[PDB]
Ligand binder design. Structure first.
Ligand SMILES: Nc1nc2c(ncn2[C@H]2C[C@H](O)[C@@H](COP(=O)(O)OP(=O)(O)OP(=O)(O)O)O2)c(=O)[nH]1
Ligand SMILES: Nc1nc2c(ncn2[C@H]2C[C@H](O)[C@@H](COP(=O)(O)OP(=O)(O)OP(=O)(O)O)O2)c(=O)[nH]1
Ligand SMILES: Nc1nc2c(ncn2[C@H]2C[C@H](O)[C@@H](COP(=O)(O)OP(=O)(O)OP(=O)(O)O)O2)c(=O)[nH]1
Ligand SMILES: Nc1nc2c(ncn2[C@H]2C[C@H](O)[C@@H](COP(=O)(O)OP(=O)(O)OP(=O)(O)O)O2)c(=O)[nH]1
Ligand SMILES: Cc1cn([C@H]2C[C@H](O)[C@@H](COP(=O)(O)OP(=O)(O)OP(=O)(O)O)O2)c(=O)[nH]c1=O
Ligand SMILES: Cc1cn([C@H]2C[C@H](O)[C@@H](COP(=O)(O)OP(=O)(O)OP(=O)(O)O)O2)c(=O)[nH]c1=O
Ligand code: NI
Ligand code: NI
Ligand code: NI
Ligand code: NI
Lengths: 451, 445, 439, 455
């Protein structure tokens, strides 16, 4: 027993957290344990990983907390492997340097810490940015996370954040958390599939762990593992078109967006004279918030305020709050492009209006390209956009050049376009002719462009 | 127009479920119930309460559990109709005319649960069974309007299944018995989401041996082992998950947090605004059904977040302990009588160092918990059906089930702040420590 | 009075545990009798993948389990069709559940004519499994026929017409045989399950959620395009990684040359030795009865091989050792059959210098010859389309709307391999320490 | 050149396996053993014998099981070496010099099994452990020539691990104990192929807590529940799969079929040709290793097909019953002594309708099957699963697990009486009246799957 500095302190016994996806999360460092236990990581239990997806895939109730630990776990497994077989002691200057282990472990655990409730929707209404806030959390002395990291060394908070912002000077560390095949994507693809119940949009983590390699340029995958790397791209693409891009979840998302926007407009309007009782949102209505105010938000804050709003003297706010709480998403139809459809969309909005729906709150144009999921688009100008396969002689070849399957998927390359509207426009009074004519513009789930 | 009662969906509707793969909805009435306000609200209430603090995958809702119970129930009905109908077995067979009502009841069996049900009923004296019946039979609810639209007597009938007075024992026992769709779903779903997996017995195997008869529901003798596996899963799920001390430590905090909130609300000397409008009728002890329906898990945690800044050190700390996961630790003890003197002394030491033992200690046993154990109320027991129709008791023919019945080492725990086991309060902490060895009380005083 | 055979539903359905589908559900007496019949039972002793097990050692599943899986998938389709898309609701574009029994029987029986190592066997002895399937279904001598004849007199021929694609209900025909059918779906899933190529598994439940009858047969909902894509990708992965594997084919060549060599020394009227190959005699002669064929299974051949290891012919004895002890020939990849012709003959003579004959130790082999076909949709042939159905009932060819499926189709995966002994790569050293120049 | 014992393959050779995903081979010795004639023939022998008749997925070979056991053992040795080497725990630690012999013993543990091993040993008085040792220690085999090439004394040492005489308890217990690589693979693999998907435990959690100590192999106390799940899976596989009556019905037919063939061969008056050359040494009770090694499942089934046409009624029919799946039906009974006179009477009745009772009936119990229950003997080290406390002391599993005590206390084995199915049923719409009253008399003794003794 010696004087062990904080950065190297180990728990007397390994701590294990049951996880349905990875079986166990293994924790050996005091620092990592203290981070998991910190106020701002604990906060992630109360924020759903998949936002509105749970309305379509009702198993999708998992938290950002569990995913954060999952990412940590995969990262830990990679570090173990790198140290065992591909260390600096074995391979020299560009081998894995295990002094990088702690920072890589912290970066993995904390990568999503700045996420708020329904963050994609919250960011569009309130001009937050989960990435900026992640950095702020890590480096602002008021957080428990900072106080832990600063106890490692004085510059440790800045270093951890630089990993997340991809400015850290070791590409093996950067690319383990963020690349085209990283611990982050690997956990969420496995976890989202496990909980939605789409268990066939799933690859083999262990085979990928068998072929993952560190090198001078970052992280590559041995050539004999090409097929396992293919399965991963297959899962990635399957999860995108089947789960994340689902029209009904997006329909709920549109409601949420329009709900939060109406609230904000009401708060700012002097002619509106009722109390929204939404104290934790006030700083965001005003566009003037602190990190502390932000850290108080989670999914429950929003739904709690929505419940209180079902009684508001505003018919639109009231209805939108109802729609979100009770699951009444807007319906959608596809169109080709914004330019062509413009005239038809405008006219359908007129019809919707005439029937008593304010088009601003009850319609939207929506694309899957707008969502935070990117396709594999390997480009030799941005090295972190490629998946590299390592040949036996140590040379690298980009995945798509050797895999026709991947090249076919990377070339499927397409995001959709949708127009949203109330279902009651199609469900079937002195509005007969209006509904009849609206329906006639919808065929095979698509806008008929007659105008 | 076709009658609501008979409104079968021309195209089946399916909901992907990670446990059962799909929930199949085949009747308009069932779809309408799933879509109704008071079922939807179950999305916002966690099935397992504080268990997620121990098993972080246990974030599944009462909503997904309710759909699961409905699904297993649908599958038993389909097997009953195909293999054991009245058309074949008469009196001992299944009358599929009962399908709609059995399905509505299975879907709604938990609709009156509030947030952190067990804890909530301890503080505010609510009752989920009674509220479930209220929801089904009160005209103000979407659920009622749907059921009443079936026929005028249908709400009361549906509720009679849940009260266990519906005159069909096959219908009653499908929803509630020792082995029913409810327990089968939660064992499988809890196992699936916690990742414990001990509680994965083979459902299709039980579905293959489940039989109707004149006095309820039995299991074919050739399915004894399948039934044993279910008993084993229950045992495991109870001993490993439901009775977990850490989860119960978080429950004690929640309990004490809500009590302190109530006390402050009633405190003439308390100036601060709790901004807890939805909890107010419960603080006051005068609440309506509509007021109860507005409650969910997110309501409580939102209010706890606001409370973290309250000028009451106890309330502020208890809210922090719940939101930031700082449970009381616990140690086992055997006797309420002999450990008493020792417990009283530990409370002194805890107080000595500045924790109010009313808030920062508790006595807790797994006997208090909502779930129970199998020991052979009106019927509630497992019957094995011989090929000749006669019925045998499971425990009489399975020594394994018999052995586990007598296995109820349900503990007793004293809860206390972790700080006690880790400034010259140091001697007090050491004293306290010497009374605790390997998560168990050392009886000294 | 008593129930017609045609209509004998079991009081309690019978279940067969299957690791792929969890359960095979049997609810008709006709189906149970067929399952229990002599010619279906013999499929237990014939491997589904022949020589693949030498490369993927878990692939020891029989054709019997595959046959039951096809039956089971077919049953699930019918049950869904009846529930949601029956004639009662859709008329002419709907499913008529009176067709259930014939469809299930055909599903179950589709492969009954398969012998041991089917592809190889047909190449040497000139047999045809399709023809034999029909023989079995229509010959008074089989238990299968007796069962079907008991349903009604014309039932055997109707069942067979389903297999031969001549039956007048395209829905019945396409369920068993099309571009995505119960057959393909089971073997892809099962071959994946047993080889352990875990992905190559697609989501069957999603396919069964999107599968639709219509007047011209079987189509798939447009909103299920991605599910259908998942199927195509699995298909591609299985072909490229499993069915086309060179090591498995290296064993196929040995077996081919082993049986072909045994034919020769039986045909050769000179050298006299008891081959002991009682059950192969009719096949050497090319005149066999059906009963003679039905006695053939994997164990028969390997039992003969065990004996052939000591036949005075060193070529046959070696070949038998090689097949029994897993000693496969190696292979390399080239492009043209006319361009490479000079390169082959040179190596042939160099192998003969070692003391082994190129006629039995080399071969020309391509992936395109195997009993597996790529999805190649044509404008004229309706059999080669996967049809997607829009909500208005209009059909769209899968490849028209899926670039991924299109890009995979145009990917002309065609192998071309020359086979040679491993002993080449290592008499004295100065014989085969030369011309390894093809790496 | 590098010594054979140390020879590593240029690149790791991976074998796709549906159970363990991959089998990993690094040693030249292991690759050669896998490739050897005696290991290869395990492809031609089913692991579960007659189980495939009740669970039709169960067609996996003893070969894939052998690679599985090797793989699990390799994973354990790997864990033992990097976490519990002698360099770290000294005396209680793992000595990686033992790796190669342990892998060899794991791969070869079942090499002496012939076709339908349990039935075959009953009729022909073979012993698969004896034969395994023979294959390892006999110069005539490919397996010997590989092992002896390791070193002169290596074959004897490999054999001693299997006979459990080898001095290192860690090596012996990894391969044979109450919780070893052998049991772990077949439980998982048998579950995987039968499709009893919930008859499985978690290999990865056991691997996380498995540990060497001076007296062998133990498991960290923090992994007790995972050890529990292993016992649970073990028990459910026994009761649901291995002990299945229909599978045992087919085994009874196989047993009597082989017995009849032996008897017919021994009859001087019966001069018909059985055409079963490879079985003749076994009929005679005089076989060599080489004659045994030629035997597999395909040899037997081939002979059974010919036997369908042999002019003995009993043999022809039994051969048909085995090829065509016509198992004997069965009824349980609890006590042999009290049931004995009744069984004799039922045997008379069965005989009366034309079924020779010696071939068409049987009595067997699950106790007779090669699956032992967990019964820890407090003074017999080998019978126990040891859990290691934080203090380093060992505590037997049942001692601290009520569930395991409950399962271990419920350890029992049935008793069945087997008879032709046709004794019970009377066709579709009954017509066959000539023995009708005998069928009814017989039927009155079979009730609720059990033999009923009249009062
Ligand atoms: N209706 C409903 N569907 C749910 C729920 N949870 C998950 N789902 C799944 C099953 C549905 O088929 C799928 C799509 O949701 P909707 O039914 O609202 O959209 P869809 O376009 O199917 O509407 P429709 O078919 O016209 O009722 O989401 C729920 O609470 N209610
Ligand atoms: N510490 C901690 N444990 C968690 C969390 N989520 C799940 N768990 C699980 C891991 C362990 O199974 C179990 C242990 O909880 P604790 O660390 O609070 O209690 P314990 O007394 O076992 O450990 P301790 O001595 O308090 O560090 O809870 C979390 O966010 N923090
Ligand atoms: N050697 C061998 N491979 C097997 C066996 N069972 C399955 N396999 C699989 C493992 C490999 O994925 C694949 C390769 O088999 P081979 O070693 O015969 O072919 P390869 O071209 O690797 O020959 P090589 O060892 O490189 O000379 O076959 C077996 O019993 N022996
Ligand atoms: N009949 C039959 N069953 C099989 C086969 N392969 C697996 N099994 C399974 C499914 C059966 O429910 C189980 C029991 O076999 P049997 O049907 O021979 O015995 P059981 O006592 O069920 O006779 P039963 O037909 O119910 O009077 O074995 C097969 O080829 N034929
Ligand atoms: C689109 C899609 C849905 N689902 C799930 C999500 C939902 O919970 C459930 C129903 O989804 P739906 O989008 O409703 O799909 P459906 O074809 O079953 O019916 P329809 O579109 O006509 O309503 O199935 C998948 O698992 N995979 C998929 O690819
Ligand atoms: C007994 C048993 C059977 N099975 C499988 C084996 C068979 O393939 C299939 C049929 O089992 P059976 O032994 O036939 O039992 P059953 O209840 O399905 O019907 P019966 O007794 O009337 O025959 O189920 C299990 O998976 N688990 C079990 O415990
Ligand atoms: Ni992430
Ligand atoms: Ni419930
Ligand atoms: Ni087929
Ligand atoms: Ni074994």
């Amino acid at each position: 027993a010696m004087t062990i500095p904080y950065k190297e302190q180990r728990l007397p016994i390994e701590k294990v957290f049951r996880d349905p996806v990875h079986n166990y999360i293994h924790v050996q460092h005091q620092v990592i344990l203290d981070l998991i236990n910190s106020a701002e990581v604990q906060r992630l239990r109360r924020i759903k990983q998949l936002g509105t997806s749970s309305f379509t895939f009702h198993g999708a109730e998992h938290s950002r907390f569990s995913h954060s630990l999952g990412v940590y776990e995969i990262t830990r497994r990679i570090c173990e492997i790198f140290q065992r077989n591909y260390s600096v002691e074995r391979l020299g200057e560009n081998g894995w340097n295990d002094d990088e282990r702690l920072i890589t472990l912290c970066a993995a655990l904390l990568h999503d810490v700045g996420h708020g409730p329904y963050s994609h929707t919250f960011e569009h209404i309130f001009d937050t940015n989960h990435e900026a806030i992640t950095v702020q959390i890590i480096t602002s002395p008021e957080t428990e996370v900072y106080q832990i990291l600063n106890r490692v060394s004085a510059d440790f908070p800045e270093k951890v954040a630089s990993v997340i912002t991809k400015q850290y000077p070791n590409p093996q560390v950067v690319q383990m958390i963020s690349s085209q095949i990283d611990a982050d994507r690997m956990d969420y693809l496995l976890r989202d599939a496990y909980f939605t119940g789409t268990e066939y949009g799933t690859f083999d983590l262990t085979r990928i762990l068998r072929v993952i390699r560190p090198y001078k340029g970052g992280i590559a995958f041995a050539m004999n593992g090409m097929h396992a790397v293919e399965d991963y791209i297959v899962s990635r693409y399957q999860m995108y078109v089947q789960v994340y891009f689902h029209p009904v979840s997006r329909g709920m998302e549109v409601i949420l967006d329009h709900l939060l926007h109406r609230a904000k407009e009401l708060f700012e309007n002097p002619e509106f004279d009722y109390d929204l009782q939404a104290s934790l949102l006030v700083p965001f209505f005003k566009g003037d918030f602190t990190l502390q105010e932000y850290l108080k938000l989670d999914d429950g804050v929003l739904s709690t305020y929505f419940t209180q709003w079902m009684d508001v003297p505003d018919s639109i706010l009231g209805d939108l709050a109802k729609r979100f709480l009770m699951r009444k998403p807007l319906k959608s139809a596809t169109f080709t492009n914004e330019k062509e459809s413009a005239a038809t969309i405008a006219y359908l909005r007129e019809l919707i209006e005439k029937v008593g729906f304010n088009p601003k709150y009850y319609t939207a144009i929506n694309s899957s390209y707008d969502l935070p999921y990117d396709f594999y688009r390997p480009n030799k100008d941005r090295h972190r956009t490629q998946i590299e396969l390592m040949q036996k002689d140590g040379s690298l070849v980009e995945l798509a050049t050797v895999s026709p399957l991947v090249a076919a998927l990377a070339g499927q390359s397409q995001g959709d376009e949708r127009f949203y509207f109330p279902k009651e426009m199609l469900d079937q009074d002195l509005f007969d002719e209006t509904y009849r004519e609206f329906s006639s513009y919808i065929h095979n789930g698509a806008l008929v462009l007659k105008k």
